[PDB]
Design a protein around this nucleic acid. Structure first.
Ligand SMILES: [Mg+2]
Ligand SMILES: [Mg+2]
Ligand SMILES: [Mg+2]
Ligand SMILES: [Mg+2]
Ligand SMILES: [Mg+2]
Ligand SMILES: [Mg+2]
Ligand SMILES: [Mg+2]
Ligand SMILES: [Mg+2]
Ligand SMILES: [Mg+2]
Ligand SMILES: [Mg+2]
Ligand SMILES: [Mg+2]
Ligand SMILES: [Mg+2]
Ligand SMILES: [Mg+2]
Ligand SMILES: [Mg+2]
Ligand SMILES: [Mg+2]
Ligand SMILES: [Mg+2]
Ligand SMILES: [Mg+2]
Ligand SMILES: [Mg+2]
Ligand SMILES: [Mg+2]
Ligand SMILES: [Mg+2]
Ligand SMILES: [Mg+2]
Ligand SMILES: [Mg+2]
Ligand SMILES: [Mg+2]
Ligand SMILES: [Mg+2]
Ligand SMILES: [Mg+2]
Ligand SMILES: [Mg+2]
Ligand SMILES: [Mg+2]
Ligand SMILES: [Mg+2]
Ligand SMILES: [Mg+2]
Ligand SMILES: [Mg+2]
Ligand SMILES: [Mg+2]
Ligand SMILES: [Mg+2]
Ligand SMILES: [Mg+2]
Ligand SMILES: [Mg+2]
Ligand SMILES: [Mg+2]
Ligand SMILES: [Zn+2]
Lengths: 50, 304, 71, 177
RNA sequence: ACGUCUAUUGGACCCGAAACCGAUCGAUCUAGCGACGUGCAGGUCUGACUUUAAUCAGGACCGAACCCGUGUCUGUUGCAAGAGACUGGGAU
RNA sequence: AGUCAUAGGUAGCAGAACGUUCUGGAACAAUUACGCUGAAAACAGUAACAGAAUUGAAGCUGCUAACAUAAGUAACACUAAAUGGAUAACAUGGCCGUAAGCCCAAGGUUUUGCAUAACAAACAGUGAAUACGGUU
RNA sequence: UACCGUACUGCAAACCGACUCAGGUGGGCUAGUAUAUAUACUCAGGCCAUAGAAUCAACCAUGUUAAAGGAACUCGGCAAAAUGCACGCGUGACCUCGGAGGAAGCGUGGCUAAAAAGACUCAGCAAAUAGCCGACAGCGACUGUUUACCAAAAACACAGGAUAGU
RNA sequence: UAACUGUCCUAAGGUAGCGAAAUUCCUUGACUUGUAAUUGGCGUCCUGCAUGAAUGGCGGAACGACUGUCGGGCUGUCUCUAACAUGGAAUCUGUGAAUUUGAAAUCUUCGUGCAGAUGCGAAGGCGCUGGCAAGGGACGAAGAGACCCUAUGCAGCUUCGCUGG
RNA sequence: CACCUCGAUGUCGGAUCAUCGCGUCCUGUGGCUGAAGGAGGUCGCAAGGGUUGGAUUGUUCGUCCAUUAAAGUGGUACGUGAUCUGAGUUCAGACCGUCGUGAGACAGUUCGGUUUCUAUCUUUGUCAGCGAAAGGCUUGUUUUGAAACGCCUAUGCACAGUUAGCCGCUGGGGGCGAGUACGAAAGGACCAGACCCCUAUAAACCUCUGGUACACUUGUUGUCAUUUACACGGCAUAGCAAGAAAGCUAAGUUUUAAAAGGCUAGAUUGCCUACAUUCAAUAACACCGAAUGACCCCGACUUACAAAAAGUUUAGGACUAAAUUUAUGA
């Protein structure tokens, strides 16, 4: 068994885990977003776009 | 492959006059070289050494003796072997006969070596060698040393240069045994094994057997019999093997290993085979075959 | 199986003797076009020589032959 | 590991033997289609030996020779050329139908390169030598070839006058059956 | 009082743990569960149903797709931070 | 300014100095320096008197950066196989053919097309019209 | 009768592994000899670009053949070699009567014959694919599960049984 | 031999059926077979250092990539290796690392020495530099943890260690 | 004892290959012998080279199978993992027994359980490169101290000390000698001095006998091509099977004395019209070969009394020249 390939990509799972709405659904996710804002990150979440 | 040769300080502080006069009176007072030997048949002194021969290996063949046993016979050929140079005890430090064999054209030889043959008055040989000989065995320059120098039943010591095989490992060069083919041995089936013995020796010995380019080595086969001599065609028929490939020249001599000084009652002509009636002999022309001698030996099938 | 110290500039130069190339003692030069090559090799226009003017071969007359062209 | 050069045998050319024979068949077909091809020295020497074997097989002109060449030689446009133009061209030549001229090294791998071409053709690079050399009957060679059993072996036209008196006959035509 | 040297409290001459306590993020690797869907060539044996008949069962057998990794060899800054070859085990 | 006495040192203790950056005393390098030496050392050759220190480095398997050594060494061996003066269109030969062919999905997100070097990415290209997949 | 997808790649040089990584990656379609998607050659189609060039080093890896022997090698026949297939005969103990069992062991095979038969070959399961067999014990009833990266086992589980609580 | 009786602390001193056995120190247990030769198996026997109905005792069919042994066949495992095939290696061209490294211009033996010296002493040797090979040394390199000891050391686990609602 | 290495360093085995000492098992030998020579016991010298099988144990310990002349004991970090194994001494899983309240311990028995490293330089084997000269000739001579000529040796090349240094180094057994000298008698030698057989070890060779032989010959299966399912061709391990020559090789064939034999350097002596290109990229073919007054290579033809390595031949490549041969009787 060769390791190293733990990242199996999937857009549904990526948006459903680290998206905006699961971050906003819980209070501590909202303080995660708030300290992302206080640090000054250009990308707030993995699914943000314009 | 030489040491740094000579500092050679030139200034002698004017003692050079004494050394130059000493050298002039030293060369002029040395004895005149002894006359040309001019050899006819001579007596057999027991402690007397004979010359050798440069013979060419021509391959191996099959013959059966009158008793009915097959003998492995190699055949050698004497390629116009002559005496080219001579060394003796008064003018040189030793007493030797210089032999030449084969032939080469003038354009195929170096000018430094062709000059030696042109001064000697002999044809251009392809191989030059020498043998230590006794005082009564000095045969003059230009004398042929053919197959008739040797006799049937004589034992000779043939010297040859082995076949080239290239670089080989210790399995066939030194005959070492390796490691088993299938018992867990990892990549070491033809390894030499242990070479040193740890910190206490701390080094590999100066005579260690390790893989190398074996081949072209001067190996001598001692005490081999002579089964047949063809004097007209210069062929000698040794029994057994001769080191070297076919076409390479080998050296022959009377066997000093079997040396009781009697030469085992072999009928050896001492200076060489001094030929009587050298006239009436043809040059390379429409000649034919001649007669040969052979030894017999007793009781090859004495019992079962 | 590993160097124990660092090789010096003198020792490195001595070790690198096998890497050097021997100079060639002969060259075949075309007098016209100034080309240079070995004496056993064609170096005219059929081989690589963009400077060839054909003067390298000074005579080539062969008009007569007769055969069946297979068509 | 078997010794091929140094013990006269075929080159290996870095290939398995079936690939090697197929590559030589392709190259001999290419050599007779375009009469001068350029390749590396080892393939060039192997091509020269194979060309001598194939050209002699075409020179026999027999049905078994045609059958053997049919598998050896691929094109079929050039099987005709080998059996007709090449056979008539070298009908009296005792071997040596091909010359080799070295041409330097190639850019991709610095391999030595040789030009291999058929001799005795319009467009060759050196004048050929005649395959036969008519003998003077007043010289030593002719008398050695009379005392010893040697044929005359003179240069000849394609149909000599020794068949002219048979072919002139109107009763030896059979009308073409 | 200033200056210098010690002393105490502070991280207190500098660098270095294994740690302990909280509250963030992780079952896209992996373990279990849950919902929906899909797949299991070719044969062999046994039991049952119906037979003018294009049905079922066995944690059955041999064996591809597929899942796993027994032994040996290679590889050991390797092709690979666990792989390859040949034998293997399961395959309603 | 002549006689005497002392001067081996680790841990440690004491005394005298050199150098770096900045500041106060109005301003000590606008137009440079460059006779190559001097001093016991630290060093000096662009003040001096005082003061404030993130003030002196071969020595912490220290950190960062650059450059060597091994060394033009190892490697460029899983496979079908290439040849003709071209990674050729043509010809010859070979390999897979339940794949090494074809159609999609997930994922990637322009990786896709054009010039016998070239000045070409700066330019192009994805069309729902069969009741195609989704959205329900 | 709108909106979104439509290029290219998709067992891979374009995804997941730091790489142009020998690893991992789901579903579907398919021709002949022929007969199964196995095996050998081939159709449609695709490929022979990512180091090349010759040659006889030693040695290493992977194989072919080997006289006379044959486990004598070795901790241990480990590794190799060997049986390997369809039609017939046959076919032990022990046994939960199911099995052991394809037990063991011996015949018969391609090619021509509108056909009672034959030819010659050293060889006719002719090339490729398809079990080594038998006996004495030990442990575990069995099929399974187990330490991803040195242990797949006598360890775990299992149907069943006993006990205790409810 | 101790079957039945005599004794002492004592919950009680281990049944038909087991045993040098996964487990028995003596050990090559005496016994038969096994081989020409057997300390590792098989079947008996008893002298159980340190066996035994729920730590389940007594064996069985079938099953096992489990373990120890015997026969047949088979063959380079071997006696004892040889030739050949493919691919590396070796030659050339092109691309092109890393481990390691106080500085090196680094000989041998004996002695000495932080106790095994390329470097110190005595004696001797050595034109110089490489390619291709073999690895005895450089206490080769690769991990500041293989094992032992220590810490005001940690961590998890256990218990008739201590304290807690 | 704890002096040396815990910024971790293979030992308690054999497989291959070694070197040294002698406290000698044999072979070579001398004394005392309660010495019939044999066969023994010691004791004195001598380390040249020889000490083999395998069945059983993880055993280096040990036997006992039966052969030899014998089945030596040690230093070798009780030699030897940057050569090999890991069978046993370091773990991690599990079972059985002992001890323990238990986590656990056992040097008690068991089954299973990663051996990394591309050689810098120190050795060692072997194959190679570099280590220049021209000195003065008053030139022995010449004119138009410069130019070559003549000398001593300087390099190069060849043969190379009754010549340094170094390596290897010469093994045995049984017969014949001798049915023997001896010896009541059974029982049987010293001498190896030489001859005959074997067997090692070492060095070669392919002549024999075999093995292998992948562009050789024969037979054959499937399949794809095949306007003939005639011949030929591809693939299936060279598809398979059989038989082959060269070359290599051993299981084959020769030789293994005092000293023999090899390797490196070399006083000398002799010679010199020697800048080193081509014939295929690994001459190892080939320097003890050839380059056209050349059979060196390659091709062609013939050979079953070569199942193929020789013979003819300048056809092709090693270029080359004319006013008597595009040319050797190659
Ligand atoms: Mg897998
Ligand atoms: Mg990652
Ligand atoms: Mg390994
Ligand atoms: Mg090879
Ligand atoms: Mg093939
Ligand atoms: Mg104060
Ligand atoms: Mg989560
Ligand atoms: Mg399987
Ligand atoms: Mg099975
Ligand atoms: Mg002082
Ligand atoms: Mg003092
Ligand atoms: Mg100021
Ligand atoms: Mg500081
Ligand atoms: Mg290179
Ligand atoms: Mg091409
Ligand atoms: Mg997509
Ligand atoms: Mg794949
Ligand atoms: Mg990776
Ligand atoms: Mg890949
Ligand atoms: Mg195919
Ligand atoms: Mg390629
Ligand atoms: Mg046999
Ligand atoms: Mg078959
Ligand atoms: Mg099953
Ligand atoms: Mg199972
Ligand atoms: Mg290769
Ligand atoms: Mg010492
Ligand atoms: Mg060397
Ligand atoms: Mg080397
Ligand atoms: Mg404490
Ligand atoms: Mg022969
Ligand atoms: Mg042949
Ligand atoms: Mg094909
Ligand atoms: Mg060989
Ligand atoms: Mg010619
Ligand atoms: Zn030109």
């Amino acid at each position: 068994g060769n390791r190293g390939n733990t990242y199996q990509p999937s857009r549904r799972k990526r948006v459903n885990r680290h998206g905006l709405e699961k971050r906003l659904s819980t209070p501590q996710g909202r303080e995660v977003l708030l300290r992302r804002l206080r640090k000054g990150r250009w990308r707030i979440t993995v699914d943000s776009f314009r | 492959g030489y040491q740094p040769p000579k500092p050679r300080f030139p200034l002698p502080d004017s003692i050079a006059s004494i050394v130059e006069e000493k050298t002039r009176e030293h060369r002029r007072s040395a004895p005149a070289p002894p006359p040309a030997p001019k050899l006819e048949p001579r007596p057999m002194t027991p402690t007397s050494l004979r010359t050798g021969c440069i013979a060419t290996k021509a391959g191996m063949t099959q013959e059966w003796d009158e008793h009915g046993v097959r003998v492995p016979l190699t055949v050698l050929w004497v390629d116009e072997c002559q005496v080219v140079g001579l060394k003796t005890r008064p003018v040189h430090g030793y007493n030797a006969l210089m032999l030449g064999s084969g032939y080469k054209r003038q354009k195929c030889m170096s000018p430094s070596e062709a000059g030696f043959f042109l001064k000697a008055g002999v044809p251009f040989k392809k191989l030059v060698a020498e043998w230590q000989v006794s005082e009564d065995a000095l045969v003059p320059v230009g004398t042929a040393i053919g197959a008739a120098h040797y006799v049937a039943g004589q034992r000779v010591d043939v010297t040859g240069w082995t076949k080239w095989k290239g670089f080989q490992g210790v399995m066939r060069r030194w005959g070492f045994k390796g490691l088993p083919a299938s018992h867990g041995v990892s990549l070491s089936h033809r390894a030499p094994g242990s070479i040193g013995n740890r910190q206490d020796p701390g080094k590999i010995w100066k005579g260690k057997k390790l893989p190398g380019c074996m081949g072209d080595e001067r190996r001598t086969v001692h005490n081999c019999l002579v089964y047949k001599v063809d004097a007209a065609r210069n062929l000698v028929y040794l029994r057994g093997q001769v080191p070297g490939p076919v076409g390479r020249s080998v050296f022959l001599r009377d066997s000093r290993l079997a040396s009781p000084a009697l030469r085992a009652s072999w009928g050896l002509p001492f200076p060489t085979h001094v030929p009587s009636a050298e006239e009436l002999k043809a040059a390379p022309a429409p000649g034919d075959v001649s007669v040969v001698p052979a030894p017999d030996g007793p009781g090859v099938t004495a019992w079962r | 199986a590993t160097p124990k110290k660092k090789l010096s500039l003198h020792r490195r130069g001595n070790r690198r003797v096998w890497y050097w190339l021997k100079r060639k003692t002969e060259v075949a030069k075309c007098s016209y076009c100034g080309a240079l090559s070995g004496r056993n090799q064609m170096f005219s226009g059929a081989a690589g020589n963009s400077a060839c003017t054909g003067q390298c071969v000074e005579q080539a007359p062969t008009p007569p032959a007769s055969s069946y062209p297979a068509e | 590991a078997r010794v091929r050069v140094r013990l006269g045998d075929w080159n290996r050319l870095n290939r398995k033997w079936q690939h090697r024979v197929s590559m030589m068949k392709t190259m001999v077909t290419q050599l007779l289609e375009k009469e001068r091809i350029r390749t590396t020295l080892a393939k060039a020497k192997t091509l020269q030996r194979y060309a001598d074997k194939v050209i002699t097989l075409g020179k026999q002109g027999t049905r078994e020779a045609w059958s053997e060449a049919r598998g050896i030689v691929r094109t079929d446009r050039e099987l005709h050329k080998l059996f007709t133009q090449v056979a008539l061209r070298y009908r009296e030549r005792p071997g040596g139908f091909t010359r080799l001229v070295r041409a330097g090294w190639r850019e991709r791998d610095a391999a030595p390169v040789a030009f291999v071409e058929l001799v005795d053709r319009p467009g060759e690079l050196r004048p050929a030598n005649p395959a036969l050399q008519r003998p003077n009957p007043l010289s030593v060679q002719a008398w050695i070839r009379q005392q010893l059993g040697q044929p005359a072996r003179e240069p000849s036209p394609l149909l000599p006058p020794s068949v002219q008196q048979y072919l002139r006959e109107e009763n030896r035509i059979q009308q073409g059956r």
